Amino acid sequence: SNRSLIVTTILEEPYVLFKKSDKPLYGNDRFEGYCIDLLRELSTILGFTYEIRLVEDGKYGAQDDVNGQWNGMVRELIDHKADLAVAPLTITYVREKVIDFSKPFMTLGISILYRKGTPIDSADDLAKQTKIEYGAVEDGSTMTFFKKSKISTYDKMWAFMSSRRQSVLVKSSEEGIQRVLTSDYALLMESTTIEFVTQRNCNLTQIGGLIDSKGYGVGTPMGSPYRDKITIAILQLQEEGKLHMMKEKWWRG
Amino acid sequence: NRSLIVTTILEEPYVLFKKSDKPLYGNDRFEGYCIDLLRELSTILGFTYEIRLVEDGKYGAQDDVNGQWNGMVRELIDHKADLAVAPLTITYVREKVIDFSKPFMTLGISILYRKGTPIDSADDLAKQTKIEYGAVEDGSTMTFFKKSKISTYDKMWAFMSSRRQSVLVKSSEEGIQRVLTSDYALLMESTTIEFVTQRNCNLTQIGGLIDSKGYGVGTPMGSPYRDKITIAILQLQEEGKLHMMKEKWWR
Ligand SMILES: O=C(O)[C@@H]1C[C@H]2C[C@@H](CN3CC(F)(F)C[C@H]3C(=O)O)CC[C@H]2CN1
Ligand SMILES: N[C@@H](CCC(=O)O)C(=O)O
Ligand SMILES: [Cl-]
Ligand SMILES: [Cl-]
Ligand SMILES: [Li+]
Ligand SMILES: [Li+]
């Protein structure tokens, strides 16, 4: 009741980072970022104290296809090792079956990162040609979406990416961003990342709108009383304009 | 086992009467995006249902004097319906008294107005009086302005509440007609504006989204269906079916 909540999280720019500071920093104050700002607001609104812990396996949370066991922050919640996961944890069907998410504090989707000043305006324009290469970070959520879409355009896109995978799937986002900057290439990625990048790379832009729709939510264990309280607090923060301010604080270049 | 009662409201392209030459029966009276959503949810979760239009014709807002809710929100509070499947906006005041699914569609408040004018933002509207503006009575857009501490929107509510018999309209239908026939701008959700402006080509959206929010399925507080419907929505989203439904109804 006066117990501190254990908050699992993971390093991910600009959601959660170690703060650079002149002053000495102790404990939770060693961290900063959008999710840390959100956590601070939630703790004030709902009146809890907390302890931030970085997740032991450096994973968000997936289910093993052979033994059915979870990992990452999702596993910490399932096992009641954490009270909250405050991180850009995507709200998905498979996860929502095993933990309880708040309503989303951010809604987003897959989109396209490309250089400015071209006539390409959609995923369709990319799908119906071969001169401009395009791809994604190998094994990421975005690539996974394409590997599964039965939507026409996206199925064609995956045909291309899969065949030319040694050429167009990259091992990291920075590798991908450099390819967009130095060659005739477009990168499929989450729109939150694209915005972060385009605020810092004035010669790049998002192409088109969103290709899918999904949200990031605060994770709680199934049955947690904090889930609905956090949802109401998030909705109020949104309506008051405060999450929008928080987003601009951490994303603007 | 037993049919659920589903409350909803007439609002195109979400819910509308299906055109026919002879009377249609029961649920077959209706079509639209939300009618298709309801059908898909019923398939995943395995329930039958009877659609009933909300008895008082309202989305739902709190009466300031006695504190009581009306509309679909009140029907859920009083267990007059099991679900509300409708373009029902998820707001923190409503989430305190009913249980929403996670959102099936995102949206934001924006402005519907005639083309070709110098007006480009809520601020332009707030800072003059010639052009009147309003919203649908007892919906979340009205309630956003009524509660807003943001200076521009607080100003707009001052205007609107002063002239509420005038500028607060009974329905989007009435609001659209007012935009078309008088010097009036309608504060309307962006999804609905996108539908309207594809049909009325002398109308346009002014500015961007004022806020960001979603539509959810409403259930009574504590309903077992709330989390089931959330999981079904995520399945439909990830399968691309919500996107296909949006393409069908916003052509
Ligand atoms: O919950 C999750 O699994 C993900 C993890 C993490 C995923 C990144 C994006 N991916 C990182 C990646 F680089 F590995 C590929 C990229 C993508 O798939 O587009 C954005 C912030 C997160 C959002 N939620
Ligand atoms: N979707 C709104 C109604 C429309 C509006 O207020 O603009 C609601 O749930 O109240
Ligand atoms: Cl204690
Ligand atoms: Cl929820
Ligand atoms: Li869940
Ligand atoms: Li609620």
Is B95 part of the contact surface with chain A (CB cutoff 8 Å)?
Answer: yes
Cis peptide before A104, with omega less than 30 degrees from 0? no
Structure tokens at B52: 């009933």
CA dist., res. B89 & res. B103, Å (int): 9
- The rounded radius of gyration (Å) of the Cα atoms in chain A is 19
* A204, A114 Cβ separation under 8 angstroms: yes
Is B2 part of the contact surface with chain A (CB cutoff 8 Å)?
Answer: no
Q: Which of A97, A107, A149 sits opposite B231 (nearest CB)?
A: A97
**Domains of chain B, residue spans:** 1-107+213-251, 108-212
Look up tokens 């809604």; give the residue. Answer: A107
Angstrom resolution of this structure: 1.8
Structure tokens at A117: 């000043």
How would DSSP label each residue in B31-74?
ESHHHHHHHHHHHHHT--EEEEE-TT-----B-TTT--B-HHHH
- State in Å: Cα B102 to ligand 4 middle: 5
CA dist., res. B217 & res. A45, Å (int): 26
Structure tokens at B232: 């079904």
CA dist., res. B183 & res. B171, Å (int): 18
Domain A109-213 has CATH 3.40.50.10800: no
Is A213 part of the contact surface with chain B (CB cutoff 8 Å)?
Answer: yes
| Amino acid at the residue A168 | V
The set of residues, in sequence order, having a beta carbon less than 8 Å from that of A204 and lying 6+ positions away, is A113, A114, A115, A116, A177, A180, A181, A197, A198
Three-state SS for A82?
coil
- Rounded to a whole number of angstroms, the distance between the first and last alpha carbons of chain B is 37
* Long-range contacts formed by A47-50: CB under 8 A, 24+ apart: A48/A4, A48/A5, A49/A2, A49/A4, A49/A5, A50/A4, A50/A5, A50/A6, A50/A7, A50/A83, A50/A84
Name the residue among A77, A58, A60, A29 with its Cα closest to residue A219.
A77
Judged by its nearest atom, the ligand closest to the C-alpha of residue A94 is 5
Judged by its nearest atom, the ligand closest to the C-alpha of residue A3 is 3
* A34, A59 Cβ separation under 8 angstroms: no
Name the residue among A69, A62, A71, A56 with its Cα closest to residue A8.
A56
Judged by its nearest atom, the ligand closest to the C-alpha of residue B213 is 2
- State in Å: Cα A57 to ligand 6 middle: 34
Is A220 part of the contact surface with chain B (CB cutoff 8 Å)?
Answer: no
Is A104 part of the contact surface with chain B (CB cutoff 8 Å)?
Answer: yes
CA dist., res. B141 & res. B89, Å (int): 9
Is A225 part of the contact surface with chain B (CB cutoff 8 Å)?
Answer: no
CA dist., res. B223 & res. A117, Å (int): 52
Angle at Cα A149 formed by Cα A143 and Cα A151, nearest 5°? 135
Instruction: Please report, for residues A58, B13, B125, B151, B179, the alpha-carbon distance to residue B172 in angstroms, rounded to integers and kept in the order given.
Output: 49, 12, 19, 26, 10
Angle at Cα B75 formed by Cα B70 and Cα B78, nearest 5°? 105
CA dist., res. B30 & res. B43, Å (int): 18
* B202, B218 Cβ separation under 8 angstroms: no
Tell me the CB-side half-sphere exposure of residue A49, using CA atoms within 13 A. 5
| Amino acid at the residue B86 | A
Determine the residue among A213, A220, A222, A234 to mutate to test chain B binding: the one whose Cβ has the most chain B Cβ atoms within 10 Å.
A213
Residue of B nearest to A92 (CA): B234
Query: CA of B151, closest CA in chain A: separation in Å?
Result: 12
- State in Å: Cα A131 to ligand 6 middle: 51
Reported in sequence order, the residue ranges of chain A that DSSP labels E, i.e. its strands, are 5-9, 17-18, 31-32, 50-54, 84-90, 99-101, 106-108, 110-115, 133-135, 185-190, 204-207, 214-221
Q: Helix %, strand %, coil % for chain A, to 5?
A: 40, 25, 35
Q: Which CATH class is domain B1-107+213-251?
A: alpha beta
H or E stretch including A232?
helix A226-239
**What is the DSSP pairing of strand B218-220 with strand B98-100?**
antiparallel
Residue of A nearest to B148 (CA): A240
Backbone angles phi, psi at A234, to 5 degrees: -60, -45
Q: Which of A100, A150, A238 sits opposite B213 (nearest CB)?
A: A238
CB atoms within 10 A of CB A20: 7
What superfamily would CATH give domain A1-108+214-253?
A: Periplasmic binding protein-like II (3.40.190.10)
DSSP for residue A222: T
CA dist., res. B163 & res. B71, Å (int): 23
* B118, B207 Cβ separation under 8 angstroms: no
Structure tokens at A48: 């809890």
The set of residues, in sequence order, having a beta carbon less than 8 Å from that of A37 and lying 6+ positions away, is A246, A249, A250
How would DSSP label each residue in A114-173?
EESSSS--SHHHHHT-SSSEEE-BTTSHHHHHHHH--SHHHHHHHHHHHHTHHHH-BSSH
The set of residues, in sequence order, having a beta carbon less than 8 Å from that of B186 and lying 6+ positions away, is B111, B112, B113, B133, B134, B135, B169, B172, B175, B176, B178, B179
Please report the atom of ligand 1 found closest to the CA of residue A89.
1
Judged by its nearest atom, the ligand closest to the C-alpha of residue A102 is 4
The structure's method of determination equals X-ray
Q: Which CATH class is domain B108-212?
A: alpha beta
Ligand 2 surroundings by CB, under 6 angstroms: B 59, 87-89, 135-136, 139-141, 188-189
Structure tokens at B96: 């305190």
Q: Helix %, strand %, coil % for chain B, to 5?
A: 40, 20, 40
Tell me the CB-side half-sphere exposure of residue A162, using CA atoms within 13 A. 11
Structure tokens at B50: 């009877």
Name the residue among B42, B15, B22 with its Cα closest to residue B236.
B42
- State in Å: Cα B233 to ligand 5 middle: 12
Name the residue among A127, A98, A116, A8 with its Cα closest to residue A57.
A8
- Chain B (22-41) residues lying within 8 Å, Cβ to Cβ, of chain A: none
How would DSSP label each residue in B103-154?
PSEEE-EEEEEESS-S--SHHHHHT-SSSEEE-BTTSHHHHHHHH--SHHHH
Intrachain domains B1-107+213-251 and B108-212 with the same fold: yes
Query: CA of A64, closest CA in chain B: separation in Å?
Result: 20
Please report the atom of ligand 1 found closest to the CA of residue A92.
1
Backbone angles phi, psi at B8, to 5 degrees: -155, -175
* Long-range contacts formed by B68-72: CB under 8 A, 24+ apart: B69/B97, B70/B138, B71/B138, B72/B7, B72/B8, B72/B9, B72/B218
Give chain B positions within 8 Å (CB) of A93: 231, 234-235, 238
Is B152 part of the contact surface with chain A (CB cutoff 8 Å)?
Answer: no
* Shortest-distance Cα residue to atom 10 of ligand 2: B139
CA dist., res. B145 & res. B157, Å (int): 5
Structure tokens at A136: 């994604």
* A107, A214 Cβ separation under 8 angstroms: yes
H or E stretch including B17?
strand B16-17
* A219, A89 Cβ separation under 8 angstroms: yes
CA dist., res. B214 & res. A159, Å (int): 34
Which of B59, B69, B91 most suits a substitution to test ligand 2, by most atoms within 8 Å of the C-beta?
B59
